């Protein structure tokens, strides 16, 4: 998308729609703590099912 938008020129519609998806990096720190803390419950629930 980046390359071809540059090739034809103009304000790309697709880039404009998903602006946050392109310009912001995804951060794992906020998440993995809670995945590990959540683990004991997840396993228990799956076992019960």
């Amino acid at each position: 998308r980046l390359i071809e938008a540059s090739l034809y020129g103009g304000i790309s519609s697709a880039i404009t729609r998903s602006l946050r998806d392109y310009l912001l990096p995804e951060n794992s720190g906020v998440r993995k703590a809670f995945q590990d803390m959540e683990a004991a419950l997840r396993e228990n629930r799956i076992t019960l099912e």
Partner: protein, 49 residues
């Protein structure tokens, strides 16, 4: 006996994984609160990048 020994290895592996989890993997049990209770920042977090 084989079951229990493998269980011991699995417990060690989870504990090792858990130490590397969050927020910037460290002795997180108390260190996060200790980091904010003084006007400071965790060194390992400064060297995250």
């Amino acid at each position: 006996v084989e079951r229990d020994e493998v269980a011991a290895q699995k417990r060690e592996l989870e504990k090792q994984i858990e130490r590397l989890s969050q927020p910037s993997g460290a002795e997180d049990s108390r260190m996060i609160a200790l980091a904010e209770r003084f006007g400071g920042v965790l060194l390992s977090e400064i060297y995250d990048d």
